[PDB]
């Protein structure tokens, strides 16, 4: 693919495939030319070296260094490592309708609530706004609804307030050691850029407000909303699943 700078950028698999094709075609040539066997042998060694580098580079001894000196990333390397495809793209992924910010106390909150910044929530519930806007007939179509949100019109705030009502949001903190590292809350729209967390659940997250941050995730489907409200809600996860004791404890 072309970078903006006019330059191109490519996978190392292309360098490994080009190695294999050059040496293979050179072998075809030297066979057409009836070359003496010492030279044929050298080319057959080099061909096996190139294929073995292409499949799994570094297993067959000294890995083939590309441009920096770093060994070229081969086929097996894209599957194997933790970074392969299993651990990185398949057993876990980057996710839509996800956000983050610094956390701060919400002592005024009830246990099942969390302060969610206005601008953050505006963005996460974009399709839900578009939808109500068209059912009220305030927006003629989606592109006009988008421009009304971009202008951040006063009627849009009132609609956004209506969508967020009784809609649970997942808060997550790294590291997620046990299941209470994810909990669902009913969000409370707040002016300001910081997420407000209920004190009593700070224990489960191991949350202290000296700059920790949290991920926000929006359960989209009716099913996901119900699993968040029933199974994952703060109120419903009071006892530690580890030992019988309440995790939700004053401190």
């Amino acid at each position: 693919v072309p970078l903006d700078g006019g330059r191109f950028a490519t996978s190392d698999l292309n360098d490994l495939y080009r190695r294999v094709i050059n040496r293979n075609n050179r072998l075809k040539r030297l066979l057409d030319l009836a070359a003496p066997d010492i030279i044929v042998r050298n080319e057959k060694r080099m061909l096996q070296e190139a294929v073995d580098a292409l499949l799994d580079n570094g297993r067959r001894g000294r890995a083939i260094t590309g441009s920096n000196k770093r060994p070229l990333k081969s086929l097996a390397d894209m599957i194997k490592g933790k970074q392969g495809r299993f651990r990185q793209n398949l057993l876990g992924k980057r996710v839509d309708y996800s956000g983050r910010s610094v956390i701060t106390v919400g002592p005024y909150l009830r246990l099942h609530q969390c302060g969610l910044p206005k601008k953050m929530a505006l963005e996460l519930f974009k399709p839900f706004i578009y939808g109500k806007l068209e059912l009220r007939g305030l927006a003629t179509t989606i592109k006009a609804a988008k421009k009304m949100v971009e202008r951040e019109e006063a009627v849009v705030w009132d609609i956004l307030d209506e969508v967020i009502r009784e809609h649970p949001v997942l808060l997550n903190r790294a590291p997620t050691l046990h299941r209470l590292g994810i909990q669902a809350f009913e969000p409370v729209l707040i002016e300001g850029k910081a997420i407000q967390l209920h004190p009593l659940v700070c224990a489960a997250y191991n949350a202290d407000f000296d700059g920790d941050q949290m991920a926000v995730h929006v359960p989209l489907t009716l099913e996901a909303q119900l699993e968040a409200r029933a199974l994952m809600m703060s109120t419903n996860n009071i006892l530690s699943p580890a030992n019988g004791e309440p995790i939700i404890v004053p401190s």
Binding site: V1, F8, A9, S11, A35, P36, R41, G66
Partner: protein, 277 residues
């Protein structure tokens, strides 16, 4: 424990015969006449020569073995077109052929985007000129400074130095540590976000509803022209193939369909709202 392809091959080459002058002449006469053994022996004996030039041609494009192999191809052409009748030695003639084939291969295979020898040769002159400029101008050559010296076009010099720009690895993690590869930064430009794809669905669906809101003959020549309902996107004159068979009446009716539809977008709430986009 000799496992290395290179050390094995170089062991095998050393283990060959070295040829003399009178021996080169005897074998060369038999070789051109088409001797099997003569060709094999002349090639095998002169492999050492390939390696000397191949060893002084590394760290430029391919690896030592790659260069040695292509250099061996030059050796073969050299043995094929050698003249033993001329008193002048084989080593002298072969050196040309080995350097030629190595250089040519290094100009083609090395560059990921295959760069033509014509541009490469021109590039060589630009670079050698830059070197002479750098020695006297303590600074480095500008594009315009190089162009002034060769009496050639600034644009042509800039195009060439642009092609010199070598390719960055996508798989390579950048942030010093293996933090994030470039692949993960760079998004798919050809794939539209679900937001954009959904907007086109809304437009395409509205059009079907807008086609059953205007006149029957105002949406029969406006859509069959753009290729909206029809199969092929025709022009004002080509709408005549269907039933219209007109040029003036087609252009009046196309624009009449659009003018009534412009007021349908001003009333529904777009027009200047959907103008920015």
């Amino acid at each position: 424990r000799v496992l290395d392809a290179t050390q094995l091959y170089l062991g095998e080459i050393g283990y060959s015969p070295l040829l003399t002058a009178e021996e080169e002449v005897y074998f060369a006469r038999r070789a051109l006449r088409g001797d099997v053994a003569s060709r094999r022996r002349m090639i095998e004996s002169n492999l050492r020569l390939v390696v000397k030039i191949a060893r002084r041609y590394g760290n430029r494009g391919l690896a030592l073995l790659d260069l040695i192999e292509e250099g061996n191809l030059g050796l073969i052409r050299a043995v094929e077109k050698f003249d033993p009748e001329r008193g002048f030695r084989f080593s002298t003639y072969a050196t040309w052929w080995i350097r030629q084939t190595i250089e040519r291969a290094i100009m083609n295979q090395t560059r990921t985007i295959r760069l033509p020898i014509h541009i490469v040769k021109e590039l060589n002159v630009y670079l050698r000129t830059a070197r002479e400029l750098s020695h006297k101008l303590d600074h480095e050559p500008s594009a315009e400074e190089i162009a002034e010296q060769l009496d050639k076009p600034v644009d042509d010099v800039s195009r060439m130095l642009r092609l010199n720009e070598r390719i960055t690895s996508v798989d390579t993690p950048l942030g010093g540590d293996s933090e994030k590869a470039l692949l993960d930064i760079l998004a798919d430009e050809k794939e539209n976000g679900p937001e954009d794809t959904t907007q086109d669905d809304d437009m395409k669906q509205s059009i079907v509803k807008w086609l059953f809101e205007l006149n029957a003959k105002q949406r029969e020549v406006l859509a069959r022209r753009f290729g909206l309902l029809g199969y092929e996107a025709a022009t004002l004159e080509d709408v005549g193939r269907e039933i219209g068979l007109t040029r003036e009446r087609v252009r009046q009716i196309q624009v009449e369909g659009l003018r009534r539809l412009r007021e349908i977008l001003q009333t529904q709430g777009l027009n200047i709202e959907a103008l920015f986009l």
